[PDB]
Amino acid sequence: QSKPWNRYRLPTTLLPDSYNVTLRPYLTPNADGLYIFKGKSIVRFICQEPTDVIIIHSKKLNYTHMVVLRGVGDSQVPEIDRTELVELTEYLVVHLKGSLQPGHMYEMESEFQGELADDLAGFYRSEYMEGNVKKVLATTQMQSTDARKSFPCFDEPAMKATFNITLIHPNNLTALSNMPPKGSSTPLAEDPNWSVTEFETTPVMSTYLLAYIVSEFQSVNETAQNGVLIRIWARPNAIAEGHGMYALNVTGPILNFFANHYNTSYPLPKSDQIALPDFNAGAMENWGLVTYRENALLFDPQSSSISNKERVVTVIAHELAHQWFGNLVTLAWWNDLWLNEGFASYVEYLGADHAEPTWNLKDLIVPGDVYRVMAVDALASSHPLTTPAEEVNTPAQISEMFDSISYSKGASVIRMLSNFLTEDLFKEGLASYLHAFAYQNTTYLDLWEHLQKAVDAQTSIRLPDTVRAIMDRWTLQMGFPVITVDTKTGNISQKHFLLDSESNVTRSSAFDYLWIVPISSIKNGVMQDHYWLRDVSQAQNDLFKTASDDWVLLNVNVTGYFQVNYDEDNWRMIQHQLQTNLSVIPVINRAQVIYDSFNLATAHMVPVTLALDNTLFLNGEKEYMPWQAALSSLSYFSLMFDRSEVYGPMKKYLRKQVEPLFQHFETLTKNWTERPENLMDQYSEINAISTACSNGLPQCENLAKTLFDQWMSDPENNPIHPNLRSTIYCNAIAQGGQDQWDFAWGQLQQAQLVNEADKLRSALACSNEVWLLNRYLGYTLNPDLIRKQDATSTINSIASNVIGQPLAWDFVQSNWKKLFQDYGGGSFSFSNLIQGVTRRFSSEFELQQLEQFKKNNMDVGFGSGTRALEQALEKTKANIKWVKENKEVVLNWFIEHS
Amino acid sequence: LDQSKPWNRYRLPTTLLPDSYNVTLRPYLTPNADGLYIFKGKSIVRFICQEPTDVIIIHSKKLNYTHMVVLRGVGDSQVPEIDRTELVELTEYLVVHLKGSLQPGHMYEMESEFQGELADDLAGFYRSEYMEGNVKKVLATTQMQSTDARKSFPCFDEPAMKATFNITLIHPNNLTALSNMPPKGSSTPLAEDPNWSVTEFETTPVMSTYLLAYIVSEFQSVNETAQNGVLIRIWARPNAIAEGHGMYALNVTGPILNFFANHYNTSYPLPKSDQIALPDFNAGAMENWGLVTYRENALLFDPQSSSISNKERVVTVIAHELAHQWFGNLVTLAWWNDLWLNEGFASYVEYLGADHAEPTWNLKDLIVPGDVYRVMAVDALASSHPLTTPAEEVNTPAQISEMFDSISYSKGASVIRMLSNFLTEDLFKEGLASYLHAFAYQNTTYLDLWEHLQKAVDAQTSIRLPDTVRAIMDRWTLQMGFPVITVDTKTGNISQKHFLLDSESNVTRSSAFDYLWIVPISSIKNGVMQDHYWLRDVSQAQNDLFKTASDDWVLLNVNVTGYFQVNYDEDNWRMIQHQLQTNLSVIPVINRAQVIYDSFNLATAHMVPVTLALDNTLFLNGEKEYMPWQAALSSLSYFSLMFDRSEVYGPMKKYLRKQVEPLFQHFETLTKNWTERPENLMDQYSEINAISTACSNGLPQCENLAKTLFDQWMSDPENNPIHPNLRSTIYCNAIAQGGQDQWDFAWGQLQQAQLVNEADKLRSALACSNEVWLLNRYLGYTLNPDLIRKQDATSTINSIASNVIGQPLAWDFVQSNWKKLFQDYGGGSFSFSNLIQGVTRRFSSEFELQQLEQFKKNNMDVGFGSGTRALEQALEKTKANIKWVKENKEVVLNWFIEHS
Ligand SMILES: *[C@@H]1O[C@H](CO)[C@@H](O[C@@H]2O[C@H](CO)[C@@H](O[C@H]3O[C@H](CO[C@H]4O[C@H](CO)[C@H](O)[C@@H](O[C@H]5O[C@H](CO)[C@H](O)[C@@H](O)[C@@H]5O)[C@@H]4O)[C@@H](O)[C@H](O[C@H]4O[C@H](CO)[C@H](O)[C@@H](O)[C@@H]4O)[C@H]3O)[C@H](O)[C@H]2NC(C)=O)[C@H](O)[C@H]1NC(C)=O
Ligand SMILES: *[C@@H]1O[C@H](CO)[C@@H](O[C@@H]2O[C@H](CO)[C@@H](O)[C@H](O)[C@H]2NC(C)=O)[C@H](O)[C@H]1NC(C)=O
Ligand SMILES: *[C@@H]1O[C@H](CO)[C@@H](O[C@@H]2O[C@H](CO)[C@@H](O)[C@H](O)[C@H]2NC(C)=O)[C@H](O)[C@H]1NC(C)=O
Ligand SMILES: *[C@@H]1O[C@H](CO)[C@@H](O)[C@H](O)[C@H]1NC(C)=O
Ligand SMILES: *[C@@H]1O[C@H](CO)[C@@H](O)[C@H](O)[C@H]1NC(C)=O
Ligand SMILES: *[C@@H]1O[C@H](CO)[C@@H](O)[C@H](O)[C@H]1NC(C)=O
Ligand SMILES: *[C@@H]1O[C@H](CO)[C@@H](O)[C@H](O)[C@H]1NC(C)=O
Ligand SMILES: *[C@@H]1O[C@H](CO)[C@@H](O)[C@H](O)[C@H]1NC(C)=O
Ligand SMILES: *[C@@H]1O[C@H](CO)[C@@H](O)[C@H](O)[C@H]1NC(C)=O
Ligand SMILES: *[C@@H]1O[C@H](CO)[C@@H](O)[C@H](O)[C@H]1NC(C)=O
Ligand SMILES: [Zn+2]
Ligand SMILES: [Zn+2]
């Protein structure tokens, strides 16, 4: 560990200035069936401190000494002793016979070769059909640490430089990169069948934002209001069919919106958006060349759903948000990832709302992010938004940082921050921040300084403490408080929300798990004065003290990142209001009441009957979010109980509650022919239909059967509205047999819209026949049938089926080596797989099997799913206790109310 | 522990031998303050000293003593002082250390007083319970075999140590007391308390401890004196007797006893033979001399509600138990390593006795699907064992319990039938009569049997053998396994080799006979019998009997009388196939089954291409008889276990639908739309299988039938419209098609069932649900004695595991509840072994093997008791399954697709 090349962080002795990179992809296999790329690069770097070793990143590259070292101007150049590759720390190491001089620059040259693999990382290959022709293209994904997989570089985000990219490609293919082309392409001297395309120099930026693509893709375009050229690229067929039109509608105006909102121009002449058939995450914010999954950019007005449409605008908005938060201004290191991802996850709502103002999509942050992340942030094995820099060291640890904490808690905490500052004041602070650190890097402390500057120049908004004092507690310690109110005395208290008394908190907090909390409140339907709970375990205020015929609720619209519990009497008054006139309570807080009480019940802080009682009013609820809250909450109940005697009465209860909503949606939609007008009501319909069919409501089963029967009789004319397809497809396959399954499989393999393929993949997992589900699992590891990008999500879908649960858990264990080698170093997929197949575990036996699984595979380890496994273990232990203590009361409650 | 001390060895010393026992027992049929049911006892055993010893070692298990022993002399005997007494739990001994040695040639009497629990554990003196109206009834009953006599009173508890027994029962004055013998005089009030009475019984014959029985209950009886003067009584719950459920047993029991008496020229020596049905009982029945005990589904019968299969079970189990009166009771095995001398014989001559009571059934043929091919599946393993194992291998109680298996019962019956067949039963029974007369009230080994059979052979001329009886039968008895006989019909070349599954099969049990057999070979050529042949103990021979012209075919082992399987060259196989296609009638029906059985078994062991076996099912399209279809169903059952979670399953079910549909349609017509059963037993069995197969593979006509009838039953539950023969299938398929409504209805019927036959069909059918939550809830019930009797717990678990959806549920269930399962059944005949086998049957992957290995490792501390060999066989079979599935799955998939 005393040798620098055996440590995961680079030395500070050398800093890069600029790169020349030329890459040449071969889109046809050689004799060994390998797709390869060849490359050559020159990096210019400066020596800051004397050193006799050059340490630079290199991953899965073969060198054809491995480097040539030259000097810039004055520099005296030491001889190369030897060069070696250190694979563990992913280094190319150049041992010298003498030291480099400080203040002096050097240029290092290399020639290399790597595989154009189907692994979705570095420079990789993507494939599709066009008619009967197999097409292969070359594309990139550098984040987090795979730029090193395409050329040797100082591969850390803060070490910014300019890049001069050249692509050598077949003369009838299009070459794309971050910047526009520099002049025209020229024929490759040795062979005019190839062309050479040089691109303009990049801005000072991070290695992980580099991109370059060689394909036959086509585009549509428009110049945006701020003069920036927007293009939408995709497979020729998708463009011809008009599937890029929607992205073109929204991209430019959203880019222009952010520039104005943050008073900071986008400094590139273009922003390309491109849809790839093979892609790991949802998208990637490469500066000037934003890459996308097809289901995140393309859109078919006749075949895509309102949900698909919403995904497209928010992912685009998210990626464009990064152009400021990530690209222009970049985290100093991955331990501060939320500076990138937290902001993009919040700012995406702002951008998307600008493009689709009628949706009220800003409200979707509460189910989508706030309560999404609280499930994990309640664990002792969570982590704070900003982790200690030394905890984030290996590539696996970096990958795992891309989680619901960095994204969703980051967005939630930032919304709370915006809300008590006002967005007007917030964006002034952010503008100051962006201008000051443009083309550089930041930490969380830099953010506070510019927000504080804004608050101090300003007299209308007042705070109980400095921005840092308040925000350090939401940022540097994990978790969140439960705020408890005694409405008889107005006593208000706070404590760290934890699942168990068993929960063993070992991460020490310098802030003693106390927060400064912004508390809004509403009494008898009328807004009260704002209040700030200081960093103390308890306080008192008459705002929270009620008369016996009054009621209060705190955290209006759940702007604050916390949950609320009341005394039993105030809960009863809330319940009575929801029966008498639920309109008096804001719709989001109707959801809150369900979310919080179930979550409290999960942690045995309130009786379970409280949570269940809070769903009784849903009988007469039409609106999206309170129903969403109940479905999300009872989803945990299903996972715990859908293999027990509780399941029968639970479904009976759900049938009873949802039937009136189903009937409501049967009439207003005119027998399902006319969709509801606005987004929320369309979402409401989708959930009602899903719930009705999921819980066996006969009217829904017959609807699904009839529609799917009709489709099979006329395959070219799909009679099912896109909004309804996921439920109709699933229920019909569940009701049906092999005829339905094989039909849908045929539709899947010929699908020409990814949205539709996505729905088919999920519905196929709904079979009630073991042999079909197991045969399906077998397909997931066959790239001809299921793309690698979709393998884990399909496995998770099958595991969600109660009959598929043991099949998938067995499958995952038996195929672990392949699954780990393919995904175990990546973000999202691997972690989601582990969380997915272990969600149900609620017995000592299941826990022992998880522990045995862990022991069996310890030597290799669990890579970017290491924290996921720990959380999986903690949550199963908690589930064991909760099921044991809750089963009897829950069973009886369902029986009595159904 | 110190093996130099006799109280630390499992076998008793031979220094002391029992003469007679006095045993007084008093069951308390109401619990004490702690909720314990107990029994109190007093016993005196008289024994002789054969050789000088300063220690008395006697068996004792779970008894509390109130030293623990008083030792007295008979007349002259020099009586040593007792130094001290101790209980050694591991070897289940009461140990009396003496000052100086007992005197050889002289007798002693040893008295003890003791207490034990009347547990619900089905062993020793235990309790059984049932409802009568709204009153909970409790009774006391016994089960001593293999070695729980010691659990009721201290005794020399080994089968060869016979004695007479004077039993006294102290019981409530309004309950009936039964034992082996009739009462001696009247009952008398208990002196201290006339609410109790005292019943002394007549002295038993000289017999083994494991045959003792005594019962205290409210039961009633029907009776009849048999043709041989013996009183027969049928005992059961008062309500069962009142409804006439004991009548069929009364019809057949006496005649079967008289038949055996005459057949073996050996009279039954006791004045009575009681048969009694118990609500709680481990095995099928037990042959206690004078008081035969039974599961209710083995003795009782309702002509309106029981099936023909239920009927066949009753008469064959009774015949089996009565068979034991000679083979087991009168003449007893010397030690448990020769168990087949008891059980092989009872499993064979049960067919003879049942055929006497029901001669129209032709039930003797049922030995082929029931015993021969049943046991071959396991006897194909390196981890099998011979009929007679080395005595030193059968030592502990777990090992003794383990011997009660398909080898000792089913291979035993098969080999004995083979023996009977080549001696002729007339000659056989003459040798057996000589055997019984010579060893009456004593004990035997396999060698004693050959000697008397040989004497019969030598005293005649018409029947010829190629060697001594011992030379032939030692090879079938002392080494495990069986040969595959392979013939090249172009040359007449015939050869034999030990049948094993894999090329990795690791046989470590050495054979002094080099795994060669002397084999009786019958044959048929183009439908006409050929001269008989014996293959000698040689790996290869040649005979023109087995050489055919290209126009001819031959088949060996007519009616599968011999315990072996047969393979032919491909051209002879093709000729057989052509015969089956052209005119199947030319081939004897049992041999049509054999063709299927053998070809699938060879396919399983990679000895023939799988396509051969599958091709041999193509003619079933036009087959109407029971046994060839049974062969296919039993054979494809393995395919189902291997493939019902794979892409093969769809095409497999499709093929089976296609094949069974004409048979379904045949019976729909013949039975006049299912209203009239076929006349004979075999055709009734064929209908049952046709219906089961059609529904299980999703034939829509059958599915419609089951839903319609079950809907009709639910609309009028007191008038069940489903004929008993069809209930198992109809119930199952309706439950599978249906939901919670059907399940809860069936559960209600089960918990109010007054007939165990019906309860059994309901239990099995409830396991057919396709809803995980219903199956898992059901599993929870199986360890609740209020809902599922302990006697039915493991069979119910096995039914659920057979459901492809229930497989992971039951495997997890068994693993997570193993501690309770082991201490309840691990000691422990039939149930425990069956449970391990049932839940692991499907394993065919490296992952499943690893999981089974880990399971083994996890519980090695306690061990696996009477399921130890079963676990080793499970592991061996899993390993073979991995290889077979890997190498067969492609050909099997393509075959089913093409032919469906
Ligand atoms: C598949 O193979 C089988 C043979 O294994 C074929 O069956 C044979 O078919 C023959 C042609 O019909 C038939 O023919 C002739 O039979 C009777 C005499 O039969 C009686 O005695 C003999 C010997 O004892 C039979 O074994 C005996 O058995 C059978 O029939 C009984 C019922 O009556 C039994 O109940 C039954 O179980 C058993 O099958 C039988 O009792 C003669 O009367 C007959 O003469 C008449 O037909 C002649 C024309 O061929 C003649 O010219 C006329 O003048 C006169 O009307 C005689 O020819 C065999 O009996 C029969 N064998 C067996 C064992 O059944 C079967 O046909 C074939 N299947 C196909 C599709 O080809
Ligand atoms: C990539 O190309 C750019 C643009 O030509 C180069 O940037 C120049 O670098 C030189 C040498 O240090 C400077 O003197 C110029 O001011 C830069 N030109 C500009 C900013 O227009 C850069 O050196 C190249 N990168 C390399 C060679 O690694
Ligand atoms: C059980 O009772 C029998 C029959 O009464 C006893 O058998 C007698 O035993 C004596 C003493 O050895 C013999 O001399 C008689 O011949 C036996 N009578 C018979 C066979 O009718 C037997 O002793 C008793 N068992 C005991 C006391 O343990
Ligand atoms: C990199 O490319 C630029 C533009 O072609 C060129 O001027 C420069 O010399 C190259 N840098 C080197 C060779 O270090
Ligand atoms: C890299 O080198 C290794 C070892 O020579 C080889 O296995 C691999 O195929 C090479 N990859 C290339 C040339 O892309
Ligand atoms: C990171 O940014 C700071 C300015 O906030 C700058 O001083 C520092 O040099 C940067 N680090 C690197 C490696 O360029
Ligand atoms: C329920 O409360 C709302 C206020 O949000 C009010 O508009 C409505 O009139 C109330 N309902 C009734 C029946 O008055
Ligand atoms: C056994 O019982 C019989 C009958 O009561 C009695 O004659 C005999 O003495 C008893 N044996 C003893 C007490 O050893
Ligand atoms: C035997 O004695 C043990 C030790 O106290 C006791 O636990 C058990 O209940 C007793 N059994 C009886 C009295 O049947
Ligand atoms: C067992 O039977 C043999 C005769 O076959 C006999 O000699 C021997 O004494 C018996 N053993 C015992 C313990 O009675
Ligand atoms: Zn992002
Ligand atoms: Zn028996």
Residue numbers in the entry:
A (entry chain B): 63 to 126, 130 to 963
B (entry chain A): 61 to 126, 130 to 963
Question: What text appears in the publication on this structure?
Answer:
Aminopeptidase N (APN, CD13) belongs to the M1 family of zinc metallopeptidases, also termed gluzincins, which comprises enzymes of medical interest for infectious and autoimmune diseases, cancer and hypertension. Mammalian APN are type II membrane-bound ectoenzymes that dimerize on the cell surface. We determined several crystal structures of dimeric human and porcine APN (hAPN and pAPN) ectodomains, which reveal the dynamic conformation of this protein.
The domain I to III module swings 15° toward domain IV, closing the active site. Domain IV contacts with domain I or III changed markedly less (~100–200 Å2 buried surface) than with domain II (1000 Å2); domain II-IV interaction thus mainly stabilized the closed APN conformation. In the closed pAPN, the side chain of a phenylalanine (Phe893) at domain IV was placed at about 4.5 Å from the hydrolyzable peptide bond, whose carbonyl group is coordinated to the zinc ion. The phenylalanine was located in the loop that connects α26 and α27 in the single domain IV ARM repeat of human and pig APN; it penetrated the active site groove in the closed conformation and locked the peptide, ready for hydrolysis. Domain IV residues that precede Phe893 in the α26-α27 loop contacted domain II in the closed pAPN. The phenylalanine side chain in closed APN probably hinders peptide release or translocation for further processing after P1 hydrolysis. Domain IV-based superposition of the open pAPN with bound RBD and that of closed pAPN showed a shift in the domain II main chain region that contacts the RBD; this region collides (<3.0 Å) with the CoV tryptophan.
